[PDB]
Structures are given as C-alpha cells and as structure tokens.
Amino acid sequence: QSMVQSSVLGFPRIGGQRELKKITEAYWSGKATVEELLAKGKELREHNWKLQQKAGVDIIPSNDFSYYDQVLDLSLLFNAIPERYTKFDLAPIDVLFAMGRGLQYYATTALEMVKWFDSNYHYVRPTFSHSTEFKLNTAAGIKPVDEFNEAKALGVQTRPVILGPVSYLYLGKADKDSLDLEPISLLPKILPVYKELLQKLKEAGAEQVQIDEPVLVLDLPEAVQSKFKEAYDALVGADVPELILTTYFGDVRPNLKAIENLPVAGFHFDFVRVPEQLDEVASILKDGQTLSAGVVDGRNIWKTDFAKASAVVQKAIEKVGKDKVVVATSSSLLHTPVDLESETKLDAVIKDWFSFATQKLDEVVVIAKNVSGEDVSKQLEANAASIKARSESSITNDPKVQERLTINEALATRKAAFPERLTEQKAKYNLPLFPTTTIGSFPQIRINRNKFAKGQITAEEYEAFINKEIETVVRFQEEIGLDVLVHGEPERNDMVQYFGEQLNGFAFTTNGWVQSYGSRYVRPPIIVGDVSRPKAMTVKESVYAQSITSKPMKGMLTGPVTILRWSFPRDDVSGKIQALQLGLALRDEVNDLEGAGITVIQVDEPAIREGLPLRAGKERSDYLNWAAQSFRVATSGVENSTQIHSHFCYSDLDPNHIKALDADVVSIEFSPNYIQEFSEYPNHIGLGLFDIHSPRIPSKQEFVSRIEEILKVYPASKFWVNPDCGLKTRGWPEVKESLTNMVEAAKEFRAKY
Ligand SMILES: [Cl-]
Ligand SMILES: [Cl-]
Ligand SMILES: [Cl-]
Ligand SMILES: [Cl-]
Ligand SMILES: [Cl-]
Ligand SMILES: [Zn+2]
C-alpha cells in the first residue's frame, strides 16, 4: 500500500477465453449443472482477484462479477422481481435467468434491455410495482456478502461494489400495472434494504463500500437530485462500512449542490472524460473526505500517459493532501477486453500502444507509486517512449494543424436539390408510384462460412457459396415482384467489423471481447490512426447481385458515426475528426459503387442516439451537426440520378436530424399519434407497414388500410412501400406471403391512379 493508494472500480468477468459465456450458455441448454456454473464463476472471481493482488492493486473490487448483469443482480437481491416470474417454482438462479433472457424457456417477456449511459454495455431495467416488496432475499444467499467472504478466504480484502439507491431507482421504471408509480418515490422502502445489506457487509469484514451513483453525470429532475442528502443520511452510520460515492462517464458539476453536504467518506470522479471538473469537485470535500481520481480509462484500450495522468493526480494532491487521494480507473474495466497478451497477430509497433484490463491493473499501480515517490523510473521511461512512438505516427501531434486540416460545406451538399434529382431518378429508374422494397436482411450457409474460417474450404468455393445464396435471395424477391432489391448480405458477419477490418487507421483483435448484453459479446475494432479506405469493401457482391437482375439493386453500407461508435476510438483526437475521416473513406466506397453501376445505395446509421452526449448542451448540439455532416460527406459525391437511401429503426428517432441528411429515400420503422412526427419530411419516405417481430402475416387489406391511413398525411408521390425492418428472424414462408400481400396492396393503389 503506497502512500497514495491504487484502486480498480470493477473488472471484466467474461474470462480471457470467454469462459463465462461458454458455461452460462451450457447451463441454459441443460449441459452444465448448477454446481458447474457456480464453480466456474468462483474460479473466474478467484483468478481475477489474484491477478489484481499480484499486480499490487490496493483497492480490489468485489460484487463486480455477474452471470448476466449487475443491475439484474441487485433486482434479485432486493426482491424487485415481478410477480409473473415467481409463479413457476423456479430456483433463484433461474429467476435471474428468466428475468434476463425471458420466461418462455420456463413456461408450459424478458425485462427491457437498456444502454448503460453512453457505454456499449446494456443492463436489465429495474421494474417496479405498487405491490413490489423490497427485502433481502436470503433464499440464494446474499451475493455481495458471499463473494466478499470468498475473496477473504483467499487472503484478498475487497471493496464491495453496489449501485446506489438513487441511481438504481431512477434507472428503473414503473411496470405496466402501476403506470402512475414514480420510481423515486420508492426510496423510503428500498433504503432500509440497502442499510441491512451494508450492515451485513460490515459484519462480514468489509471496511469500505463503493456505492455507484452515475446518474449524477446526467441532467436530473429536482425530485430526484434533491434526494441524495436524505438517502446518504440514512445509509451512513457506525454500523456500516465507509461509503465511497462513485460517479463516472461525465461531469457532476451541474449537480454539485445536491452532494455538497453528504456524510459519505469520500468520492470518485472521472478525470478521463472530464479532467476540468477537478477544481470544483475538490472544493466540496469536508471533514477528511477522500478523493478518488479516475485517470486510467475504463472504456478504452490505449496505454495511459503516465506523465499526464500523474500531473492530474498531483493537482488533486495539491488540493486535498496525499493521504486523501486515491489513484483509480475512471470507471469499471467491464468496458475493456480482458488481456492484451493473448493477441498474436497485431503489428508489434501498434500492440505497444495498447493496454487491456489486465494491463490497466499495472498502470494504476505505476501511477500511484509515481506520485507516492517510489522508483518506477523504468516503467515511466518505457511509457514515455510508447506515448511518443504513438504521437509520431499520426500526421501531426500539433492541434493547430489538426484543427485546421479537418469539411467545406460543398463537400457536404449534393449537386442539386432533391426536386431536381427526382426528375433524373424518375427518368433513370422509371419506378412506379408506391415502389416496393425491403430493408436488407433475409432468412439465412452458416456451416460454409465457418468452414472457410476453419480453412476447410477455399476462397473460390466460399465465393461460389456466397453467390448461390445471393442468387436464391435475388430470385425470390423477383418472384414476389419487389421493385428495388437487396442481396441479403450473406458475406457479412457484423455491420461494423465488416468495415473495421478493411479500413486503414484500424486494427482488429483475435480475442478482444467485451460484454455487450448477457452472454452476447462484441469484439470491437480499434481506430489507431488516420482513417482511409484501401480497397473496394462491398463492391464485389453488389456488382454480382446486380448482374443477375435487371431491377435496381441496393448497395449497403454502414455510416461513419456507427463505425466510430461501435469501435474503440483514438483518445488523441476528437470524435468529430474521426467521423469526418470515416465519412471521406465511405465517400470513396460510394463513388466506387456508383462507378460500378450500383446507383441505388443505402447508408445506415443505427448508432446515432446511442452516441448522444449525456447532457443537453454544446457537445450534444455539435454532435448532431457533425454526425449529419459526416453522413453527407460520405454521400454527396454522387450524380443526381444516384439514389441515396437510409433506414432508421433505432429507438427514439430525431426527425430533425433525419431531415438534415438530405437522403433521397428513407425507411422508418412505424408499425399512436406518431405519423405526425414525420409529416414534414422533405424527400421520399417509407413508413414501415409491418412489424417483423409481431407473429402474424398481415393480409393485403391490412396493408391497404395502413397505406390509406398514411395517405391522410403524405402525398402518394413521396410514398415508398416496405416493412419496418429486416426479415432475417422470420421463416421463408411467412416472408413470401407477407411480402406478396405487400406488393399486391401497392399494386391496388397504383391502379387507383
Ligand atoms: Cl441457486
Ligand atoms: Cl442540446
Ligand atoms: Cl426540411
Ligand atoms: Cl387517398
Ligand atoms: Cl415528391
Ligand atoms: Zn431496422
């Protein structure tokens, strides 16, 4: 324990080879027994605790492990279990899984999955009723207490991590039988349950608890933020551990007044995202409260600059004293891959710039020792050379050249306004009124794709297999009589990795898995440098699909903002600069598609709202502006007769931003008074006419009446006819009938003209 302690806010639990996914999925399909699942959990926790102890981390977390989601874990522990999950005599591990994955696997719905702030993790929404009885569920045991005791038996003193009451309630929602319930009003009922838990943790031997209150980086209603004082007045006492109120991902300053007189033992703040909040946040400390300074990024894969991170910490030190500063990860390392050392195919120069969760443990320790005065000179020197090698690999380290060298409006504008383009597109494609199309995906080829990865087939044979599947999908759309076709994207794994693995300025990993939801993990690409496009990324398969039909075939691309958001970004330049470079890369792909005869092109940005900055203000309004501008740069090089499409199904869509794209045609998921939101849409628009989830083939008449309802709002000149989203989750027969009814409905309308 150095004078200045080191701290980790959580550790990824998935395992270095995805052991957690393997044993959990095996348990669901009735392979693994309950004991084997629990033994694997125990073994992961032990390994991870020991890894952190061996690296020298002073404050090591417990309760950060989960078989599914830590928020779900708290719902189970506090008995926030809707009544429908208790009716099948399920063991507690199965109640957890039924809430997480859904009840249908136990019957004779899952809870809502929600983004965790602006990370790429998702949690299971706490759901509350007037009938909810909050109590400590000793049924299974008490997860925090049992896992604290497990670590202690191993000779590892840990700090339990729990999501705090205010955040837990605020992030939850009223169940359907209680739509009047304001979750925050439940605080008096849930606080005694937190108190009992905290008492039990003190009794087990915990000296300090990390109590996460991240909603403090959000714009909080007064009815919510005015409660921090009475919540923590109630929790703090001599019978519970010291409480470290922990925030991350943002700026708490706007909420400072709410937490300026809390009886807690100290705070944690994110000084990676918001280093500038230091002065103000430090000023609220009283009574020997401690400041945990988050300076090792828990959400990115870059070696930390030890000189710069040490200097931020040294400012904290100057402000509250060495005995009251802690060096910490900025957030849980849940959001980074487990271990860089399992990567064997990375360029050696680039691998030297990275640090994954396991390596971050060494980094916080190095920084804590640095400011404490210990000799880590060798590590500082190595680190200073890595940082320099990295800064020298981009066009300029200088922000003056960097700010100036990054979009003239011309680059972001088509050559003519839509009405003029429409005249040329009509003449080129001769589409009728109510033209029909689909969004992209069709029912699925699994084997052969894996065989080609395994080396069992050659590229030529894989190519022949891709081409037969494209052919089958194209011919099926022709038989149905759709007007604008898609190729089914059989060649693509994932709409981001497919691009991230081809673009310049990117690296990709073999094992760089991060948990996204439950047992579903992602392996995000990494932007390491200035981005450009080195080859034709999608042209081959599109040109093949277009060569077998006389109907127009959509090219299909992912837009720049979505590639950026589903990748690990550079931490040395703005997101804006990266999006614009990605925009210019995609512009070359679009221009190539067009040049190869693919003149109808869909460019999809499903991650927009996900990347929305957490507070209303300047960063948010800039984001929307540059987000749109990036899309326009990608799409504005084309001739007037080339038709740009874009599809939108991504939760709470912003029609103002959609309008800023100047896309020729948009499709919008749609199947109460919602049609009015897009009533002023300027170009062409296809409001989805059926729900690709709903379990029923809509009749022709059902299509006809839905088209009639839309025609009360839109002109027929603007209207495209298409489903809500892709069809890969349906069976072929339901897809044939649905789409056949859709086209026949369309034709009826054409005739009535
Ligand atoms: Cl159990
Ligand atoms: Cl705003
Ligand atoms: Cl407009
Ligand atoms: Cl009408
Ligand atoms: Cl029109
Ligand atoms: Zn969709």
d(CA 4, CA 328): 10
Cβ-Cβ contacts under 8 Å for 182 (sequence gap 6 or more): 174, 223
Cα-Cα end-to-end distance for the chain: 82
DSSP summary character for residue 721:
B
Whether residue 322 contacts residue 383, with contact meaning beta carbons closer than 8 Å, is answered with: no
Of all ligands present, the nearest one to the C-alpha of 679 is 3
Token duo for residue 632: 């326009």
Q: Which two tokens stand for residue 739?
A: 């789409």
Cα separation, 156 vs 150, in Å, equals 9
The answer to whether the CB of 281 falls within 8 A of the CB of 269 is yes
- Report which of 234, 168, 166, 224 is spatially closest to residue 199, judged by C-alpha positions: 234
For ligand 2, the distance from its centroid to the CA atom of residue 388, given in whole angstroms, is 37
CB 371 within 8 A of CB 536: no
Displacement of CA 668 from its chain's centroid (Å): 21
Q: Hey, what are 534's tokens?
A: 């080195």
Rounded Cα distance between 297 and 301, Å, is 8
Query: Which residues neighbour ligand 2 (ion) by CB within 5 Å?
Result: 616, 620-621
Matching residue, tokens 């991870």: 48
Residue 128 bridge partners (DSSP): 174
412: which DSSP letter?
A: G
Q: Please, what sign has the CA dihedral across residues 316, 321, 322, 328? A: negative
Q: Which ligand is nearest to the CA of 433?
A: 5
Question: How many Å apart are CA 542 and CA 449, to the nearest integer?
Answer: 18
What whole-number distance in Å separates Cα of residue 522 and Cα of residue 462?
Answer: 24
Q: What are phi and psi of 418, to 5 degrees?
A: -50, -45
Is-contact 669 649, C-beta < 8 A?
A: yes
Residue 306 CA to its chain's centroid (Å): 28
Cβ-proximal residues to 691 (8 Å cutoff; 6+ apart), any chain: 671, 724
Match 């995609």 to its residue by tokens: 586
Three-state DSSP state, 53: helix
Q: What was the experiment behind these coordinates?
A: X-ray
Residues tagged in the binding site annotation: 21, 120, 439-441, 489, 494, 517, 520-521, 566, 604, 647, 649, 669, 725
Alpha-carbon separation of residue 146 from 63, 120, 200, 568 (angstroms): 9, 29, 10, 35
Cα(262)–Cα(245) distance, rounded to whole angstroms?
Answer: 9
Element (H, E) at 268: strand 266-270
C-alpha span between 313 and 534 (Å, rounded): 42
- Distance between CA atoms of 58 and 327, rounded to whole angstroms? 10
Residue type at 636? S
Sorted by where each starts, the structural domains of the chain and their CATH numbers stand as: 1-392+510-524 (3.20.20.210), 393-509+525-753 (3.20.20.210)
Helices vs. strands in the chain: H and E counts, helices first: 26, 21
CB 365 within 8 A of CB 57: yes
Ligand 6 centroid vs 738 CA: distance in angstroms? 17
Q: What spacing in Å lies between the alpha carbon of 61 and ligand 3's midpoint?
A: 51
CA–CA separation, 735 vs 712, rounded Å?
28
Pair type for strands 113-115 and 122-124: antiparallel
Distance CA(364)–CA(341), nearest Å, equals 18
Cβ count near 22 (within 10 Å)? 16
Assigned token pair, 643: 């038709």
CB 705 within 8 Å of CB 690: no
Neighbouring-strand partners of residue 267: 245, 291
CA angle, residues 150, 69, 81, in degrees to nearest 5: 100
Q: Tokens 């729990």 — which residue? A: 162
Decide: 78 and 190 in contact? Cβ < 8 Å: yes
DSSP codes joined into one string, 316-328: HHHHH-GGGEEEE
Q: Name residue, tokens 């807690």.
A: 264
Q: Which residues are catalytic?
A: 693
62 strand-pairing partners? 160
Using the mean position of ligand 2's atoms as its centre, give its distance from the Cα of residue 474 in Å. Answer: 44
Taking the centre of ligand 4 as the mean of its atom positions, its distance from the CA of residue 712, in whole angstroms, is 6
Return the number of other C-beta atoms located less than 10 Å from residue 493's C-beta: 12
| Residue position matching structure tokens 């994110």 | 270
Ligand 2: distance of its center to the CA of 617 in Å? 4
Ligand nearest to the CA of 658: 3
Q: How far apart are CA 315 and CA 311, in angstroms?
A: 6
Contact status, residue 9 vs residue 333, Cβ threshold 8 Å: yes
Residues with CB under 5 A from ligand 1 (ion): 91-93, 140
Distance of alpha carbon 42 from alpha carbon 48, whole angstroms: 10
Q: Are strands 266-270 and 127-128 parallel, antiparallel or unpaired?
A: unpaired
Using H for helix, E for strand and C for coil, what is the string for 155-209? CCCEEEEEECHHHHHHCCEECHHHCCCCHHHHHHHHHHHHHHHHHHHHHHCCCEE
Collapsing DSSP to helix, strand or coil, 390 comes out as helix
Q: Reduced to 3 DSSP states, what percent helix, strand and coil does the chain have, rounded to the nearest 5?
A: 45, 15, 40
The whole-angstrom separation of Cα 113 and Cα 100 is 8
Distance in Å, CA 623 to ligand 2 centroid:
9
Alpha helices in 375-445 (DSSP H): 377-391, 399-404, 418-429
CB neighbour list of residue 205: distance below 8 Å, 6 or more residues apart = 148, 149, 152, 157
| Contact assessment for residue 168 and residue 211, using Cβ atoms and an 8 Å cutoff | no
Instruction: For residue 42, give both structure tokens.
Output: 């125990």
Residue 56, class by beta-carbon neighbours within 10 Å (0-12 exposed, 13-18 middle, 19+ buried)? middle
433 DSSP assignment: S
Ligand 4 centroid vs 752 CA: distance in angstroms?
A: 9
Binding residues for L-homocysteine: 439-441, 489, 604
How many other CB atoms are found less than 10 A from the CB of residue 388?
Answer: 12
Breaks (C-N over 2.5 A) in the chain follow: 108, 406, 444, 671
Q: Are 266 and 242 in contact (CB under 8 A)?
A: yes
Q: In whole angstroms, give the CA distance from residue 557 to residue 440.
A: 11
Q: How big is the CA angle at 440 (ends 504 and 457), to the nearest 5 degrees?
A: 65
**CA 616 – ligand 2 centroid, Å:** 4
The closest of 101, 64, 422 to 212, measured between CA atoms, is 64
Question: What distance in angstroms lies between residue 651's CA and the mean position of ligand 6's atoms?
Answer: 10
Note whether 211 and 171 are within 8 A (CB): no
Ligand nearest to the CA of 624: 2
Name the nearest CA neighbour of 92 among 140, 24, 156, 20.
Answer: 140
Which ligand lies nearest to the CA atom of residue 660 in the structure?
Answer: 3
Length of the chain: 753
Smallest CA-to-CA distance from 97 within 32, 144, 163, 158 is with: 32
User: Crossing angle, helix 143-153 and helix 187-204, to 10 degrees?
Assistant: 20
At 155, list the tokens. Answer: 């000779």
Helix (H) or strand (E) holding 20: helix 19-28
Assign 550 to helix, strand or coil: coil
What are the tokens at 399?
A: 């922000």
Q: Residue 129: CB partners within 8 Å, gap ≥ 6?
A: 82, 83, 174, 175, 177, 178, 181
Whole-number Å distance, alpha carbon 637 to ligand 3 midpoint, is 21
Distance of CA 486 to the CA centre of its chain: 27
**Which ligand is in closest contact with the Cα of 704?**
4
Residue 677 near residue 689 (C-beta atoms within 8 A): no
Secondary structure in 3-state letters for 569-592: CCCCCCHHHHHHHHHHHHHHHHHH
Please tell me the distance between residue 660's alpha carbon and the centre of ligand 3 in angstroms.
Answer: 8
Q: Which of 636, 613, 473 is nearest to 549 (CA)?
A: 473
Owner of token pair 């696997």: 105
Going by the annotation, the residues of the binding site for Zn(2+) are: 647, 649, 669, 725
Q: For residue 20, what are the CA distances in angstroms to 67, 339, 476?
A: 7, 15, 40
Place of tokens 């894969």: 301
Other CB atoms within 10 A of residue 720 CB: 22
Rg of the chain taking only CA atoms, in angstroms: 27
Query: In angstroms, what is the span from residue 657 Cα to ligand 2's centroid?
Result: 12
Residues 675 and 727 sit within 8 Å (Cβ to Cβ): no
Query: Across the strands, what pairs with 54?
Result: none
Nearest alpha-carbon partner for 310 in 239, 379, 369: 369
CA separation, residue 580 to residues 394, 507, 565, 684 (Å): 16, 19, 13, 26
3-state secondary structure 439-460: CCCCCCCHHHHHHHHCCCCCHH
78 Cβ contact list (under 8 Å, min separation 6):
134, 135, 136, 137, 190, 193
404, burial (CB in 10 Å: exposed 0-12, middle 13-18, buried 19+): exposed
Pairing of strands 127-128, 173-174: parallel
Q: Would the CA dihedral through 340, 345, 348, 350 be positive or negative?
A: negative
Strand partners, 568: 526
User: Within 13 Å and on the Cβ side, how many CA atoms surround 534?
Assistant: 9
Ligand closest to 653 (CA) is 6
**CA–CA distances in Å: residue 599 to residues 416, 439, 568, 667:** 16, 16, 32, 18
- Residues annotated in a binding site for 5-methyltetrahydropteroyltri-L-glutamate: 21, 120, 494, 517, 520-521, 566
Residue 148 CB partners (closer than 8 Å, separation 6+): 62, 63, 158, 160, 201, 204, 205, 206
Closest listed residue to residue 148, CA positions, set 209, 190, 191: 209
From the CA of 719, the nearest ligand is: 5
| C-beta separation of 740 from 706 below 8 A | no
Beta strands in 493-586 (DSSP E): 504-507, 514-517, 520-522, 526-532, 554-558
Closest CA to 560 of 535, 584, 579, 578: 579
Euclidean distance between CA atoms 223 and 227, whole angstroms: 7
Reduced to 3 states (helix: H, G, I; strand: E, B; else coil), residue 246 is strand
Distance, in Å, from the CA atom of 317 to the CA atom of 293, rounded to the nearest integer, reads 10
Separation of 477 CA from ligand 4 center, angstroms? 27
